[PDB]
């Protein structure tokens, strides 16, 4: 993550190796109690299917809303929304009748599943099946439930896709005719969102020069989308110091509107940890990318006393 | 909903409901057994007790990686990685030491200790954590953690809400200068994704009339960022029967790119699913919006013979 | 509530009524059962005690909090921090030093308090100190802890108070020189708070004539701040029916706004209760107000089919 | 807090650590005072119960009188009157269903439910249910439900969100046109709300110097709405020293004028408060909007001598 030691890093094993530690010294204990080992085992199996239990009693409960959407939400199927209340039916019903065996075989049954069942229900109606926020965190990286992976996968595919291939020539064909402008794209990633529409409010060392040749293209139904890139001029200690294609990441923008509005449900951490995502993502695009062939640069800083012309001219001359 | 009826509703509370029926029926059912209900208490204390201590553990594990990312999504405060963790650590606290004193007090903890990390350390390394598909599809509805979501809200802020406000006037240039289009925006929103870039390519009736004048405006960066639309003509039986200015929704089509790229982990299952969110993102969005002055109409359809020049005509003639 | 019949009433005594009926069933209750008054009332007694010791907890929890804001909400004084937190502290601690003698002497102490010390305590750990929506709304529209209540009282104060004394001058005045307008300031309360800016758009048949001589005045330091209304006709069939002083009431377009953005922490419902909450105090202020000497007339709907054209009209010729 | 100390900052969590040190505590007492820990689960179960069925008694009078209001406030939905009266039908149902199993079936239900309904009538009657000074602020605060809020957001809305964007290119084009007029504006904040219609009047060295180009805009109706603003000259002994677009923030009129009004119900301790909430908000507001640009200042301060030159200058020079 050479872009801002801001940006973090994707999630590792920590919790693995720390559950193993965990577990080592619990048998560690367990040694050390002198139990026997036959107790344990046949109390840890209880302890499993209890938690079975509880699970195929959430499902049950989730099922009753889920069966409400099997047409818009699961075809019109009863399989796919049991599939999805309580994962492999196979697998629970296989757990289930295992913890059925065992419990009601290892030193009453109905009595546990009332209990168990109205634990449920409490946690149910108490709101108490929440997720800590880090693991609300892990399960959308890992599954890509996050608006940052859509608007870093939109900016490529829209606009970066179909732009980076055609700006080496659409510069070219700029010096021919006049400027000393670089070959390649720049892209300020501010992690504070704030994007003003004219660079020069942000910092007055960069001057809008000219525009490059319009790159015009059928899209979605609208004929002759055009596509349009700005030159700046980078000023320093008064004169010249660097001249590029820049410009602001749009989708930062949005996010920024997205917490402004009550109705996107999206506040301003959510905003500032969405814009690290779409940074990261966005930089994971590139790297993989053929289009990207070293045509663009992306620049992510985070305002303070700084320079944004001093951002761009270091990222230029080295 | 009323763009398709293959959109699904949000969630409500039948979860709740079987919750309460399962209560009623576990309490029904420690009646008729003739059980103290002193036990019952201390049991059901004590299984909440279990609850507890094994959120304390995995709480653990997970701070073990967490404090990795202290200083980029915490901003080095241990006091938010433990929080992102264990929830509010006040309560957690208090709720710790109530399940000590009641655990180690009613009719050996460290036994039970012992046996929850084990249990709690097993179902950490094997993967046995994860939620289900429905558990994962409402927690990501409810703190809207989608890319459908982001999709919706960069469409309306960065397109729509700079372009209806200003669409009348165009159209009555447009109508001034030029035939009878009606006066208003029809989106198209193909629930299977598959935007052609030219609509006489989807259905010959559709048929590119001409260009409403170009919108300039400074995005971001860029100098004279030009937003056109396009007005075709719609072929009933060969004669022009309407006229509109239509559009697929772009961002559908980086649904469709997304699950066809492997580096997004984005399914067609998943795309399918986000691309009726966005349909109903976008429609509450612009329920609300005051924008939407009747300035545009959202098209959803599904391809079971089909024909989109119908559809358009149909959402007209209304 | 002549406005419209969806502005609900101020809330009346039916709590006390049935907190009557209920009182009078359970002394009924008690009779039946035959148990003796005294031990009704020793019983009664203790509860009541319960509840002043639980209020005492409750009041040094929060203590321990206000006194944080000592000097900046309480002057730098601990009486009134005490006064806050717990009422009166005269009367809390005659009624605890009566809630000792009467639970000592009739038939623990310290287990007692500290059970209702762990009940307080976990009601505010779990943050079950909640109150419902509904006293909730009542304590806030008893001590008129409503935005609306300021909106109402400063568009009287800062427009109303000043316009409408001056108002049938300007009619007049323009009348001389031209126009057959009415001798009354018209106000447009919808209670969807969609405030168009061009009324023209809400209903063509509002169509603009001309101004009103401005009234210019010295307003907190602004040197002549100036007042301006727009004088607009009415259409009936095509033709003329009507000419009056017309405008939406400014501050429903605030509340608007502030359901918007996620800042103001405001909601729709929230946005309709206050809505109808303004219009309500705004009808109070008029009645009660020797500026209003039948010089402004007030019109609420509920946009459904209708017109606004037809509102103003029948509040005109009637 | 930066405009001013007075300015109370947000309650934080202090009542929650309070409150986990009583538990504490509690649970310590019980462990020394030697009593059965089941016995201290049943009472404090029972404890809860009654809590229960208080809330619900509760809700039933509040119901008595809300469902009056059934089509006003709550669109005819008898459901929505009881989620309003008693929260969640939900859980409180499965709360009172506990409650009865409990209590009817731990070591006479009816006569508890008597004496409790009569404790609660009698605090209904007697009006016992007053919430604290102390917590009807924080539930103000934590809902919002305060004047300030609306002043605050009224003030941004209506006129900074509109005159800060334009207020550079109108300093400009006056400082073209005419002295060296500071390119901000400064707004006071006077906390005893005593703003005069004239700087001046105020204190002498503040004198009127001239105004900027009046900005017209439509609003709500009217047409060509004027927003004008004054500069004035700032007399360091005698001598002008600096020049700014100065104004009293208009809102806290209003709170002077409130708590003159009978009518409002609104206290000059009230007043002050909410002036200082106003203020606290209107900071909050400009730290986040896009719209603020270094474009004003806040001025908030209290007269104990004091002068008003010297402290706008002070913010001037910095
Ligand atoms: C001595 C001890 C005494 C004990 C005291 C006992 C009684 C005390 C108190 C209160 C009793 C409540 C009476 C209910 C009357 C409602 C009848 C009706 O008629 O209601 C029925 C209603 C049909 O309506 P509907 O057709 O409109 O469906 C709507 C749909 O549900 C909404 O779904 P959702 O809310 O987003 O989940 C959707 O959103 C909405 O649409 P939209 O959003 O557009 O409005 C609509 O479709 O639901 C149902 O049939 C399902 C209910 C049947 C199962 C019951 C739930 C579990 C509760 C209790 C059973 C266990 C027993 C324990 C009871 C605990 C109490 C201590
Ligand atoms: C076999 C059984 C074993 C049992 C296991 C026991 C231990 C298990 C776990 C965890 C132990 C936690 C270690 C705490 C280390 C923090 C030290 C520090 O150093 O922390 C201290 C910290 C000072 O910091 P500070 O100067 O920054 O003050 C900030 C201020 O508080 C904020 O106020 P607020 O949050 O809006 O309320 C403000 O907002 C913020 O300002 P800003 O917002 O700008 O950031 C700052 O001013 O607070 C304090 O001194 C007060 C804390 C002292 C009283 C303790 C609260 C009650 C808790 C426990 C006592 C009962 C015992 C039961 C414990 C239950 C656990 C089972
Ligand atoms: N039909 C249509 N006609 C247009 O002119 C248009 N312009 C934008 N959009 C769509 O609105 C949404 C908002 O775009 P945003 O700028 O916030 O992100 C954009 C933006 O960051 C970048 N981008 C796309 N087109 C341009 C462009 N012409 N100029 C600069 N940047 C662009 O790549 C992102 C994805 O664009 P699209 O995924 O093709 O559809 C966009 C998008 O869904 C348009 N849609
Ligand atoms: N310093 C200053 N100069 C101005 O030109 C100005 N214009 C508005 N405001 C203040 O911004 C806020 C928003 O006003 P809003 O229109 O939403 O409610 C306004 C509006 O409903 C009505 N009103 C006041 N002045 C006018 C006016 N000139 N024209 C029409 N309506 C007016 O009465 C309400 C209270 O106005 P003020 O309480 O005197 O201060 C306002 C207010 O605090 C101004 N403040
Ligand atoms: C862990 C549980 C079981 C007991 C904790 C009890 C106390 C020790 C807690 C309760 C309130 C806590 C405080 C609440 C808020 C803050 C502010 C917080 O802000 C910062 O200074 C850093 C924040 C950042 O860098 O984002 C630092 C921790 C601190 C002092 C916390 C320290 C620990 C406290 C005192
Ligand atoms: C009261 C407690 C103890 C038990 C209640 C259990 C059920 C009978 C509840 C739970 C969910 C409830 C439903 C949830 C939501 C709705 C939608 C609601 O919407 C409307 O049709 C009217 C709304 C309006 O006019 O604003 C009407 C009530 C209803 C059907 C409720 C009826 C009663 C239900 C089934
Ligand atoms: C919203 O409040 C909750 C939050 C959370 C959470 O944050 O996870 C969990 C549970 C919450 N409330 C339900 C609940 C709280 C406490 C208890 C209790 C008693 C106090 C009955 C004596 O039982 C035993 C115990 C040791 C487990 C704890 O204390 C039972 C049920
Ligand atoms: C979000 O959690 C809560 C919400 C609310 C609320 O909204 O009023 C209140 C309380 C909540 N948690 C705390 C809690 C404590 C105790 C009980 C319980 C047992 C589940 C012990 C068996 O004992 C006392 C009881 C019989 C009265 C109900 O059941 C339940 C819950």
Not at 117 to 127: E, H, K, T, V
Not at 131 to 151: D, Q
Request: aromatic content about 10%; charged content about 15%; glycine content about 6%.
């Amino acid at each position: 993550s050479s872009l801002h030691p801001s940006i973090p890093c994707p999630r590792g094993h920590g919790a693995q190796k720390a559950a193993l530690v965990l577990l080592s010294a619990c048998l560690v204990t367990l040694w050390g109690l002198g139990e026997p080992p036959e107790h344990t085992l046949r109390y840890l199996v209880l302890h499993l299917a209890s938690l079975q239990l509880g699970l195929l009693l959430n499902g049950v409960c989730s099922l009753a809303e889920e069966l409400r959407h099997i047409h818009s939400r699961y075809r019109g199927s009863y399989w796919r929304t049991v599939r999805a209340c309580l994962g492999c039916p196979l697998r629970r019903g296989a757990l289930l009748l295992l913890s059925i065996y065992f419990y009601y075989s290892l030193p009453p049954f109905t009595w546990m599943l009332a209990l168990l069942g109205l634990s449920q229900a409490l946690n149910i109606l108490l709101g108490l099946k929440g997720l800590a926020p880090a693991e609300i965190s892990a399960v959308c990286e890992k599954g890509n439930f996050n608006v940052a992976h859509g608007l870093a996968w939109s900016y490529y595919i829209g606009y970066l896709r179909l732009i980076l291939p055609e700006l080496q020539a659409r510069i070219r064909t700029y010096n021919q005719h006049y400027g000393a402008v670089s070959q390649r794209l720049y892209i300020l990633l501010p992690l504070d969102c704030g994007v003003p529409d004219n660079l020069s409010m942000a910092d007055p060392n960069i001057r809008f020069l000219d525009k490059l040749p319009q790159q015009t293209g059928d899209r979605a139904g609208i004929k002759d989308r055009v596509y349009s890139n700005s030159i700046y001029e980078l000023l320093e200690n008064g004169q010249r110091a660097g001249t590029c294609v820049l410009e602001y990441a749009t989708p930062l923008q949005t996010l920024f509107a997205m917490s402004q509005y009550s109705q996107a449900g999206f506040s301003r951490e959510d905003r500032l940890e969405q814009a690290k995502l779409f940074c990261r993502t966005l930089e994971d695009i590139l790297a993989d990318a053929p289009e990207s062939q070293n045509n663009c640069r992306l620049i992510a800083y985070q305002e303070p006393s700084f320079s944004l012309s001093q951002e761009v001219l270091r990222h230029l001359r080295q």
